[PDB]
Amino acid sequence: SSNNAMLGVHASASAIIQYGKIARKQGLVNVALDILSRIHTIPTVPIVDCFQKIRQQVKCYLQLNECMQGLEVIESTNLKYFTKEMTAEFYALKGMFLAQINKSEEANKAFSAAVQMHDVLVKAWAMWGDYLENIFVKERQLHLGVSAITCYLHACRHQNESKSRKYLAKVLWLLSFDDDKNTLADAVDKYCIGVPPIQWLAWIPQLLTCLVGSEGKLLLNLISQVGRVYPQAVYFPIRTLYLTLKIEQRERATAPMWRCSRIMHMQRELHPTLLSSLEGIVDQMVWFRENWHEEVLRQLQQGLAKCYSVAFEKSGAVSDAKITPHTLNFVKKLVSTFGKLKGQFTTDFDFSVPGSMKLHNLISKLKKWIKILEAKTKQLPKFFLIEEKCRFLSNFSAQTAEVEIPGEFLMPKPTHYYIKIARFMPRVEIVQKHNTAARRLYIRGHNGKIYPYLVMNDACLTESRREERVLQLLRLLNPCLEKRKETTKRHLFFTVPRVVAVSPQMRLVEDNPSSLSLVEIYKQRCAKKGIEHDNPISRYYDRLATVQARGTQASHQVLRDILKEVQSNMVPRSMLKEWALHTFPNATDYWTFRKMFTIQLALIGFAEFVLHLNRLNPEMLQIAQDTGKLNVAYFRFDINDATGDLDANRPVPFRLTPNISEFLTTIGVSGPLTASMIAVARCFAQPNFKVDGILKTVLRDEIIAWHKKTQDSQQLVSLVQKAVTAIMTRLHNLAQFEGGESKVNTLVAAANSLDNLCRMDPAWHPWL
Amino acid sequence: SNWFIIGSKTDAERVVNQYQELVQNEAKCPVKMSHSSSG
């Protein structure tokens, strides 16, 4: 009864299998087969080790003319008898292998035999559902799509904590392929009971936008199930959507509002103390609003930004620049909202008429209004205690209600990670932002740590729901960068913040100290000298007008000369390098900050160019001093108003300033900057990772929201899939390997070229 | 009336398997395994 010998053989065989398995994960199959061929020299091999040996080998052949060799290798073994439980997984693998080629008339019975064993394999249902998914490409077969979602729902019953978000994305995407009959919704409701509600926390906004639309009442069962377990995660979005519908309909009973009200009433009976506490917190946030000094100042900054966009459009034309009707209405709104002694001075000074035919006479005046309003509001108080103007917020402890940190339900995790509320700090600060001065409060949890949070009062809710969807898309793709090795070595992560929407006009965002932008760095350096910050912009516009005043059209050469003049006089090439040298006296800290800056910049540039993101303004890029991580505020999709082409026609691929290029080094712009983009490109291009399903779901409601704003058929589906194919077309154009290295080197070489930067909006600040 | 927080089904056996492994080691007098169900 020898036991030590068999344990050593079992341990040795497991080590060989593990070493062979990890070699396959490295992307090399030829060397893995040689390692897996070493087991043949051992005369005594257990049965279970042999099954793992052939399971790894068939996976190596699947990843690697040679298809005949892989087909005939599985028939040599598996001769007499195997046990029941391992006679189910590799039937699915060979069925998938047969489905990889045109032989599909005999693979249907292969999938049936694989699933018939014990009906609890995630893999067996996944590939069978995926095999059915390939069928839907042609011959729609409307009454068969209920079978596909049936397979996905069964596969989601056992798969937990991993590889489950992609399956729910497929269910949501296939739900929007419904005709007038409601048979698809009936199939979902009857076949979804049993799955845990923890997997529905990552698609809350997707469920909301389907509930608002037509024939969406049957989806209310899933919302009630989620709210019965987690009331906080599905409370704020419901209130925000209910208030959004009330406001838009007030300008112009509502079934979507009745559904939201019904959902509210069912969750009132479940933990009413928590709902009452949440109502008190929301109702006590009305005292954090700013005065009219900042509201007028913030509106003027938005108007000045709009004027710059309008002025850039009138480039190459005459110097007339007739006032657009949109700007005329904005001026009219300013008079209405402003018209005890300074409140009527603007009416008769310069706002009696919005301008007859001049546009440069308005931008040049608003410059000094900002200066007057900036120096006047420098005496504004910064401090105010919580013991006044509010009582419930000040007198709050953990004994009242079970309130958690706002934002803990964005991404489910296997661990709990639930930080509670202990006491609101009686200490708040006012920080000057690029447009307003928002208030930041400090919240301390039960663990003793203090978590600051910033209170925003951003208007224009229409251009605000497309700013969180892109952040949610980035948060979904973040875990996908850890399953590989090339992306793991460079420590790549998107550094997404935490944003919680409470009300359509006010919402809470995560803020940290020592988080300044690149434009603010220029302001500090420019204020040290004896010049104003808006010199390069004014010099660009007026000098070009004088050149055009001679009747000569502007050419490329004149743009190059004036761009060099700005770089020679006002902004030197090494402004940022000197700022970081003096800020960080330690050599080790400077290296870590610069290395983290390069790593974060590559991910930001990759996201801006590939997925058709918004243009990167210099006031949008934020730099953290404590750690060096980078995050850009409030991304937005680029969709044309005429139609959803999803085209970004810009000269440069992303923002690569000459200041940034020299700041890292001339070596860091080539080696580390391009290697990170290549590594990310391979990770997203792996066929194993499911990327199409996530993109389709995000672009589904993105077009729906766009269609609902500007005036329900197959055209929307075709438009969404056309955009998805464009995304994959650009992804594949920068991830292939051939005799040449890649196409990333070509685009990064033209990004820092002066030819592509001189034809850019001066507000984009190509020089800075 | 002490109670424990437990997540989905998969987390249940992991706690049970960990609890079974811990109690099996430093007793050494018993060797057995008995369990039942009601409902």
Curated annotation (Swiss-Prot), chain A:
Write down which residues bear the modification named N6-acetyllysine: 53
> What does the record list as coiled-coil region(s)?
none
Give the PI3K/PI4K catalytic domain ranges.
Answer: 425-732
**Where does it reside?**
Nucleus
Residues covered by the FATC domain? 736-768
Q: Where is this region: Catalytic loop?
A: 612-620
Segments of this protein annotated with the region G-loop: 431-437
Which parts of this chain are annotated as the region Activation loop? 632-657
How this chain assembles, per its entry, is:
Interacts with MYC, E2F1 and E2F4 transcription factors. Interacts directly with p53/TP53. Interacts with GCN5L2. Component of various HAT complexes. Component of the PCAF complex, at least composed of TADA2L/ADA2, SUPT3H, TADA3L/ADA3, TAF5L/PAF65-beta, TAF6L/PAF65-alpha, TAF10/TAFII30, TAF12/TAFII20, TAF9/TAFII31 and TRRAP. Component of the TFTC-HAT complex, at least composed of TAF5L, TAF6L, TADA3L, SUPT3H/SPT3, TAF2/TAFII150, TAF4/TAFII135, TAF5/TAFII100, GCN5L2/GCN5, TAF10 and TRRAP.
The similarity annotation says: Belongs to the PI3/PI4-kinase family. TRA1 subfamily.
Annotated domain remarks: The PI3K/PI4K domain is required for the recruitment of HAT complexes, and the MYC-dependent transactivation. Although it is strongly related to the PI3/PI4-kinase family, it lacks the typical motifs that constitute the catalytic site of PI3/PI4-kinase proteins, and lacks such activity.
Function description: Adapter protein, which is found in various multiprotein chromatin complexes with histone acetyltransferase activity (HAT), which gives a specific tag for epigenetic transcription activation. Component of the NuA4 histone acetyltransferase complex which is responsible for acetylation of nucleosomal histones H4 and H2A. Plays a central role in MYC transcription activation, and also participates in cell transformation by MYC. Required for p53/TP53-, E2F1- and E2F4-mediated transcription activation.
Task: State which disorder the record connects to this protein.
Answer: Developmental delay with or without dysmorphic facies and autism: An autosomal dominant neurodevelopmental disorder apparent from infancy or early childhood. Some patients present with intellectual disability and renal, cardiac, genitourinary systems, as well as structural brain abnormalities. In some cases, the phenotype is less severe, has no systemic involvement and is characterized by autism spectrum disorder and/or intellectual disability, sometimes associated with epilepsy. Affected individuals manifest variable dysmorphic features.
UniProt protein name? Transformation/transcription domain-associated protein
The protein's organism comes out as: Homo sapiens (Human)
Curated annotation (Swiss-Prot), chain B:
- Summarize the subunit comment: Interacts with MAPK14. Interacts with ATG9A.
What is the documented function of this protein? Required for MAP kinase p38 (MAPK11, MAPK12, MAPK13 and/or MAPK14) activation during gastrulation. Required for down-regulation of E-cadherin during gastrulation by regulating E-cadherin protein level downstream from NCK-interacting kinase (NIK) and independently of the regulation of transcription by FGF signaling and Snail. Required for starvation-induced ATG9A trafficking during autophagy.
| Name of the protein described by the UniProt record | Transcription factor SPT20 homolog
Q: In which tissues is it expressed?
A: Highly expressed in testis, moderately in brain and pituitary gland. Expressed in several fetal tissues, including lung, brain, thymus and kidney. Expression is down-regulated in malignant prostate tissues.
**Belongs to which family?**
Belongs to the SPT20 family.
What highest taxon heads this organism's lineage?
Answer: Eukaryota
> Where does the record place it?
Nucleus
